[PDB]
Amino acid sequence: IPIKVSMRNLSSLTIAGGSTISSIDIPLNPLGVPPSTIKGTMRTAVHNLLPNGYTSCGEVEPESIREAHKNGVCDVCKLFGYPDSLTGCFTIDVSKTDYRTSYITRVSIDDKTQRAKEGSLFTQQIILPNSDISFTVYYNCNDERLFKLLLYSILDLRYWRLGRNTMIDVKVNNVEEICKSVKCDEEINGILNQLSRYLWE
RNA sequence: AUUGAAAGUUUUUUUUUUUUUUUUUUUUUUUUUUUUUUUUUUUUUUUU
């Protein structure tokens, strides 16, 4: 079930990728925004903002993940996949490319005085705000509670940082096919309506 | 059902301080309010 999600950053969004040829203190990924960044950020938001009636490992160590999975549910961990049990649950791909770029710099003001610290000046590469990013979340499994959890994940992504504490506003450009596919629930309809438009008009 | 897997390149840092668009520069120098015009004409200090 495809989910055509369009996200537009509300600030000077940026991520650090890398390049052998680079000079900016804060690099950028050559392709743009990778699916891994989105997936990890969404998982973090879900764990920190966990909807009622769900379980989250909230662990980085795979051994700790296994220890949490000793009981063995971790609804969030099931949605994002066991380390070595399930092949997968959902996929993220980004098609749009060719973002805008500009080099800015930042300082660190002294505390005792109000002047900039001598030698605390570093630069940062950013993506210009109000730039649209479209990515599709292909959920291949067959489960409604996990699908609702994924929708809650996307919704919570709105109230969450994405790269250098940069605010974002997620928008879903498909409600008709989502309702047509399966489980056009009233709660599902309400959350999809909430995600249908930007939080900030 | 890929040899096979699951991890946000993330956190954290105010491009800030020092500096009066300031001093000097007189809206003055010149030009007669003069110029032609008669306070003039008419009238008996006086009658029954």
Numbering used by the authors: 2 to 202
Question: Which statements did the authors publish about this structure?
Answer:
Here, we report the cryo-EM structure of the Csm Type III-D complex from S. solfataricus (SsoCsm), which uses CRISPR RNA to bind target RNA molecules, activating the Cas10 subunit for antiviral defence. Type III CRISPR effectors use their crRNA guide to bind cognate RNA molecules, which typically arise from mobile genetic elements (MGE) such as viruses that have previously been encountered by the CRISPR system. This binding activates the Cas10 subunit, which in different species harbours an HD nuclease domain for ssDNA cleavage, a cyclase domain for cyclic nucleotide synthesis, or a combination of both (reviewed in (Tamulaitis et al., 2017)). Type III CRISPR effectors are evolutionary related to type I systems and both share a CRISPR RNA (crRNA) binding “backbone” made up of Cas7 subunits.
The structure of the SsoCsm complex bound to a 48 ​nt crRNA shows its architecture in unprecedented detail. We solved the SsoCsm structure at a final overall resolution of 3.52 ​Å. As the complex was purified from the native host, the bound crRNA is heterogeneous, being sampled from the over 200 spacers present in S. solfataricus P1 (Rouillon et al., 2013; Sokolowski et al., 2014), so the 40 ​nt of the spacer have been modelled as uracils. Overall, the structure is reminiscent of that of other Csm and Cmr complexes (some examples are shown in Fig. 1A), formed of two intertwined helical filaments of multiple stacked subunits wrapping around the crRNA, although SsoCsm is the tallest. Examination of the foot of the complex shows that there is almost no protein:RNA interaction for the Cas10 subunit, while Cas5 makes tight contacts with the guide RNA molecule. The final nucleotide of the 5′ handle, G8 (sometimes also known as position −1 to discriminate between the handle (−8 to −1) and spacer (1 to X) regions of the crRNA), is flipped, as seen in other type III complexes such as SisCmr (Sofos et al., 2020). The remainder of the crRNA adopts a regular pattern with every sixth nucleotide adopting a flipped orientation. Previous studies showed that SsoCsm is unusual in not cleaving at one of the flipped sites, generating a spacing of 12, 6, 6, 6 between sites (Zhang et al., 2016). The missed cleavage corresponds to the Cas7b subunit (1432; chain N in the PDB file, Fig. 3C and D), while subunits competent for RNA cleavage are Cas7a (1430, chain L in the coordinates file), Cas7c (1425, chains F and G) and Cas7d (1426, chains H and I). Analysis of the structure reveals conformational flexibility that most likely relate to target RNA capture and Cas10 activation.
